[PDB]
Design an enzyme around this catalytic site. Structure first.
Site, PDB file in Angstrom:
ATOM      1  N   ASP A  16       0.818  -1.192   0.000  1.00 50.08           N
ATOM      2  CA  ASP A  16       0.000   0.000   0.000  1.00 50.08           C
ATOM      3  C   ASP A  16       0.901   1.314   0.000  1.00 50.08           C
ATOM      4  OD1 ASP A  16       0.987   0.206   2.675  1.00 50.08           O
ATOM      5  OD2 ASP A  16      -0.887   0.201   3.698  1.00 50.08           O
ATOM      6  N   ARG A  30       1.065   6.866   0.033  1.00 50.16           N
ATOM      7  CA  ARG A  30       0.131   5.870   0.461  1.00 50.16           C
ATOM      8  C   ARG A  30      -1.003   5.816  -0.597  1.00 50.16           C
ATOM      9  NH1 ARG A  30      -3.461   2.584   1.916  1.00 50.16           N
ATOM     10  NH2 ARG A  30      -3.841   1.952   4.070  1.00 50.16           N
ATOM     11  N   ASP A  35      -6.818  -0.912   1.688  1.00 49.39           N
ATOM     12  CA  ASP A  35      -6.044  -1.513   2.781  1.00 49.39           C
ATOM     13  C   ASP A  35      -5.516  -2.833   2.332  1.00 49.39           C
ATOM     14  OD1 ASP A  35      -6.409   0.279   5.092  1.00 49.39           O
ATOM     15  OD2 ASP A  35      -8.535  -0.331   5.080  1.00 49.39           O
ATOM     16  N   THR A  36      -4.205  -2.985   2.208  1.00 51.01           N
ATOM     17  CA  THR A  36      -3.600  -4.257   1.877  1.00 51.01           C
ATOM     18  C   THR A  36      -3.175  -4.904   3.195  1.00 51.01           C
ATOM     19  OG1 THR A  36      -1.336  -3.288   1.747  1.00 51.01           O
ATOM     20  CG2 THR A  36      -2.523  -3.507  -0.267  1.00 51.01           C
ATOM     21  N   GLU A  38      -0.349  -6.348   5.695  1.00 49.95           N
ATOM     22  CA  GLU A  38       0.953  -5.731   5.807  1.00 49.95           C
ATOM     23  C   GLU A  38       2.048  -6.696   6.147  1.00 49.95           C
ATOM     24  OE1 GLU A  38       0.809  -1.696   7.654  1.00 49.95           O
ATOM     25  OE2 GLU A  38      -1.377  -1.884   7.246  1.00 49.95           O
ATOM     26  N   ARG A  82       2.839  11.340   4.279  1.00 49.05           N
ATOM     27  CA  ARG A  82       2.744  10.528   3.008  1.00 49.05           C
ATOM     28  C   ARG A  82       1.752  11.214   2.044  1.00 49.05           C
ATOM     29  NH1 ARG A  82       1.525   4.592   5.290  1.00 49.05           N
ATOM     30  NH2 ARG A  82      -0.175   5.872   6.268  1.00 49.05           N
TER      31      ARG A  82
END
EC number: 3.1.31.1
Length: 136
Positions: A16, A30, A35-36, A38, A82
């Site tokens: 992500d 980002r 949402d990946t 992690e 980010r």
């Protein structure tokens, strides 16, 4: 009206998060709206499909001819500094490619940064229906 701007890959960090040279400066981005799992989750660390999501984003960006960034209509950085954007590799949106493969879910969405939300939701519904990766 959103527009794509050119950028240069420095290094993919996680599924992500990518470091990119943007307007002449290295900056961490980002990926908006996804949402990946992690590999460097703050409490959890290495989660299931985390390495897979990470490899997928890495391959997609590293093998591209052209990387572009597209800001949405709201804030353009988060609280960690980010950049928040949609990222395209050869015209394909990385954020969407991840959700379409069942390697990300659609995040909790914060207006006004929700422009491609419906589009991503549709891909997510498809990936769930196909039982891919996270959905199997």
């Amino acid at each position: 009206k959103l527009h794509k701007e050119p950028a240069t890959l420095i290094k993919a960090i996680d599924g992500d998060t990518l470091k990119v040279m943007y307007k002449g400066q290295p900056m961490t981005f980002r990926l908006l709206l996804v949402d990946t799992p992690e590999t460097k989750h703050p409490k959890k660390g290495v989660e299931k499909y985390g390495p897979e999501a990470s490899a997928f984003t890495k391959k997609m960006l590293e093998n591209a001819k052209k990387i572009e960034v597209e800001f949405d209509k709201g804030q353009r950085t988060d609280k960690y500094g980010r950049g928040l954007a949609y990222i395209y590799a050869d015209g394909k949106m990385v954020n969407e490619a991840l959700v379409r493969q069942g390697l990300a879910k659609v995040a909790y969405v914060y207006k006004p940064n929700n422009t491609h939300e419906q589009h991503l939701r549709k891909s997510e519904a498809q990936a769930k229906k196909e039982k891919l990766n996270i959905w199997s």
